[PDB]
Symmetry: C15
Subunit: 82 residues, 15 copies
C-alpha cells in the first residue's frame, strides 16, 4: 500500500477519463438510435439497412469512451509511475 500525490491523482484521473468520456458518446448514441427506430417505423422494409448503419455508428461512438476506459485501466493496472 502506498499513498502519494500520484496515486491520488491516478484514481481521480481514472474516474474522469471514463466519466467525462461517456458524455458525448452517450448523447450521440441516443440521437442516432432515436432516428434509427423512427426510420424503421417509417420504412420497415429498410430495417436491415438501417440496423447495419446504426451498428457501425454505435461502434464508432462506443470506441470513443473505450479510449477513456483504456486510459483508466492503464492508470489502475499498468501505472507507469506508481
Amino acid at each position: 500500500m502506498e499513498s502519494n500525490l500520484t496515486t491520488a491523482a491516478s484514481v481521480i484521473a481514472a474516474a474522469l477519463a471514463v466519466g467525462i468520456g461517456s458524455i458525448g458518446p452517450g448523447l450521440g448514441q441516443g440521437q442516432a438510435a432515436g432516428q434509427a427506430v423512427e426510420g424503421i417505423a417509417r420504412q420497415p422494409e429498410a430495417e436491415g439497412k438501417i440496423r447495419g448503419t446504426l451498428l457501425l455508428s454505435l461502434a464508432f461512438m462506443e470506441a470513443l469512451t473505450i479510449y477513456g476506459l483504456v486510459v483508466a485501466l492503464v492508470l489502475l493496472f499498468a501505472n507507469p509511475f506508481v
Copy 2:
C-alpha cells in the same frame, strides 16, 4: 482501517465515475426510447423490428456507464494502491 489522501481520492473518484458516467447515457437512452415508442404508435406492425433495434442501442449506451461502474468497483474492491 486506513485513511490517507489516496483513500479519500478513491471514494470521491468512485462516485464521480458512476455519477458523471450516467449523464450522457441517461439522456441518450431517453431520446432513443422516446422515438421508439413514438414509432410503435405510428407503425404497430413494426414493433418487433423497433424493439430489437432499441434493445441493441440501450445496451451500447448502458455499457458506457458500466465502464464507470467498473472503475468504481475496482477503486473500492480491488484498489491497486490502497
Copy 3:
C-alpha cells in the same frame, strides 16, 4: 466514533453518486414516458406494445442511477477503508 479525511470524503462521495447519478436518467425517463403517453393517445390499440417497450427502457435508465446508489451504499455500509 471516527472522523478523518476519508470518512468526510466518503459521505460526500455517497451523496454525489446518487445526486449527480439521477440527473440524466431522470430527464431521459421523462422524455421516454412523455412520448409513450403521446403514443397511447394517438394509437390506443398499441398501448400494450408501447407500455412493454417503455418499461424495458425505464429499467435500463433506472439501473444507471442504481449504480450510483450501489456505490453510495458500499461507502456507507461496506466501506473498504474506514
Copy 4:
C-alpha cells in the same frame, strides 16, 4: 453534541443528495405529465391507459430522488462514522 470535519461533511452531503437528486426527476416528471394531459385532451377515451402508464413512469422517476433521500436519512439517522 459533536462537531468535526465528518459531521460537517455529513450535513452538507445529506442536502446535496436530496437537493441535486430532485433536478432531473422533477424536470422529467413535468415532461411526462405534460404529454399525458395533452394526450387526454386529444383522446379522452384513452385516459385510463394514459393515466396507468403515467403513474408507472412517475414512480420510476420518483424512486431516483428517493435514493437521494435514503442516503440523506442514513447520514442523519444511521451515520456509520459519527
Copy 5:
C-alpha cells in the same frame, strides 16, 4: 449559543436542500400545468380527467422538494450532531 463548523454547515445545508430542491420540480410543475390548461381549452369536456391526472402529477413533483424540506427541518430541529 453554539457555533462551530457543523452548526455553520447545517444552516447552509438546510438552505441548499430546499433551494436547489425546488428547481426541477418548479420547472416541471409549470410544464405539466401549462399543458393541462392548453388541453382544457382544446377539450373542455375533458376538464375533470385532465385535472385529476394533473393533480396526481403535481403531487409527485411537490414531494421531491418536500424531501429537501424534510432534510432542512431535521437539520434545524432534530440535528443529530449539534
Copy 6:
C-alpha cells in the same frame, strides 16, 4: 449582538434559500400562466375551468418557494444554534 461563523452562515443561508428557491417556481408559473391566457383567448367559454386549474397549479409552485421562505425565517427568527 453576536458575530460568529454560524451567524454569518445563517444570514447567507437565509438569502440562498429564498433566492435560489424562486428560480424554478418563477419560471414554471410563467409557463403555466402563459398557456392559461393563450387558452382563454382560444376558448373564452372555458375561462372558469382554465382559471381554476391554473390557480391550483400556481399554489403548488408557490409552495415550493414558501418552503425556502420558511427555512429563511427559521434561520432568522428561531435559529436553533445562534
Copy 7:
C-alpha cells in the same frame, strides 16, 4: 457603527436575496405577459378574462421575489444577530 463577519455577510446576503430572487419571476412574468397580449390581439373580446388571469399570475410570481425582499429588509433593518 459595527463591522464584523456577520455584518459583511448580511449586506451580501441582502443583495443576493433580491438579486437572484428576481431571475425566475422576471423571466416568468415576461412569458406570461407576452402570451397575454398575443391572446388579446387574437381575441379582443376576451381581454377582460385574459387581463384578470394575467394579474393573478403576475401577483403569484411577484410574491416570490418579495420573499427575497423581505429577507433583505430583515437583514438590514431587523437583523437578529448584528
Copy 8:
C-alpha cells in the same frame, strides 16, 4: 474616511443587487414587449387593450429590479452598519 470588511462588502452588494436584479426582468420585458408589438401589427384595433396590459406587465417586472435598487440605495445612503 472609512474602510473595513463591511464597507467593502456593502459596495459589492449594492452592485450585485442592481446588476443581477436586472437580468430576468430585462429579458422578460423584451419578451412581453415583442409580443405586444407583434399583436398590434396583427390587430391594430386592439392597440389600446394591448398597450394597457403591456404597461401593467412592464410595471410588475420593473418593480422586481427596483427591489434590488432599493437594497443598493439603503447600502449606500442608509447603511445600517457602516
Copy 9:
C-alpha cells in the same frame, strides 16, 4: 490618492453594476425591437402605434441598466465610505 480594500471594491463594484446590468436589458431590447420592425413590415399602417409601444418598452428596459449606472456613479463620485 488613497488605496484600501474599499476603494478597490468600489471600482470593481462600479464595473459589475453597469456591465452585468446591461445583459438582460440589451437582449430584451433586441427582442422587442426585432418584433417591432417585423410588425411594421407586416402592417406599415400600424407603424405609429408600433413605434409608440416600442419606445415605452425600450424606456422601461433602459431604466434597468440606468439603475446600475446610478450605483456606479455614486460609488465613483459620491462614495459614502471612501
Copy 10:
C-alpha cells in the same frame, strides 16, 4: 508610477465594464437588425419606416454599452481614488 490594490482593480474593472457590457447589446442589436433586413426584403416600401424604428432601437442598445465605457473612462482618466 503608482501600483497598489486599487490601481490594479481599476484597470480590471475598466475592462470588465466595457467587455461584459457589450454582450447583451451586441446580441440584441443583431437580433433587431436581422429582423429589420428580413422585413425590408418582405416589404421594401416600408424601408423608411423600418430603418427609422431600427435606428432608434440601435441607439437605445448602444447606450447600454456606452454606460460601461463611461465607467471605464472615469476609472482611467478621472479616477476618484488613485
Copy 11:
C-alpha cells in the same frame, strides 16, 4: 521595464476588454448578416436597401467591440498608473 501588480493586471485587462468584447457583437453581426443575405435571395431588387441597413447595423455592433479596443489601447499606450 517595470513589473508590478498593476502592469500585470493591465495586460490581462487589455486582453479581457477586447476578447470578451467581441462575443456579443460577433454573434450579433452573424445573425444580422445571415438575415440580410437571405433577404437578398428572396428579393434581389431590395439589395440596395438591405445592404444599407445592414451596413448601419454592422457599424453599431462593431463600435461595441471598438470600445473594448480603446480601453485596451489606453491600458497599453496611455496607462494612467504604470
Copy 12:
C-alpha cells in the same frame, strides 16, 4: 516508484485528453449517424452512397479523439519528463 508534481500532472492530463476529447466527436457522430439512418429510411436505394459518406465522416471525427488518445499514451508510455 516515482511521485512528483509532473507524474501527478501527467496522469490527470492523460485523462483530460481522452475525456474532454470525446465530447465534440461523440455528439457529432450521433448527429451525422442519425441523419444517415433517416436518409436511408427516406431513400433506401441511396444506402450505399449514404453509408460511404457517413463512414468517411465518422473517420474524420474519430480521428479528433484519437489525437487525445495519442497524447494520453505518450504521457503514460513515452513520457519525455518522468
Copy 13:
C-alpha cells in the same frame, strides 16, 4: 531573458485575447455564410449580390478577432512594461 509576474501575465493575456476573441466572430461567420450559400441555392442569379454582402459582413466580423490579435502582438512584440 526575463521572467516576472508581468511577463507571465502577458503571455496568458496574449492567448486569451485571440482565443476568446475568436468565439463570437467564428460562430457569427458560420451563421452568415450558411445563410449565404442557402440563398445562392435558392436564387443563383443573386449570387453576385449575396457574395458581395457576405464579404462585407465577414470583414466586419474578422476585424473583431483581429483586434484581439493586435493586443496579442503588442503584448509579445511591443510590450509597454516588460
Copy 14:
C-alpha cells in the same frame, strides 16, 4: 527524469490543446456530415458534388484540431524550455 513547474504545465497544456481543440470541430463535422447524408438521400445524383464539398469542409475543420495536436507534440517532443 525531471520535474518542475514547467514540465507539469507542459503535460497539462498538451492535453488541453488536443482535448479542448476537438470540441468545436467535432460538433461542426457532425453538423456538416449530417446535412451531407440528408442531401444525398434527397438527391442521389448530386452525391459526387456533395461528397467533394463535404470532404473539403471536413479538412478545414480537422485542421483546427490538428493545430492543437501540433502544439501538444511540440510540448512533448520539442519542448523549448524543459
Copy 15:
C-alpha cells in the same frame, strides 16, 4: 534547461490559444458547410457558386484559429521573454 513562472505560463498560453481558438470557428465551419451541401442537393446546377462562396467563408473562419496558432508558435519558437 529552463523553468520559471513565465515558461510555465507560456506553455499553458500556447495551448489555450489554439484550444479555445478552435471552438467558434469549428462550430461555424460546420454550420456553413452543412448549409452548402444542403444547397447543392437542392440546386446541383449552383454547385460551383456555392462551393466558391463556401471556400471563401471557410478561409475567413480558419484564419481566426490561425491567429491562435500564430500566438502559440511565437510562444514556443520565438518567445520574447524566455
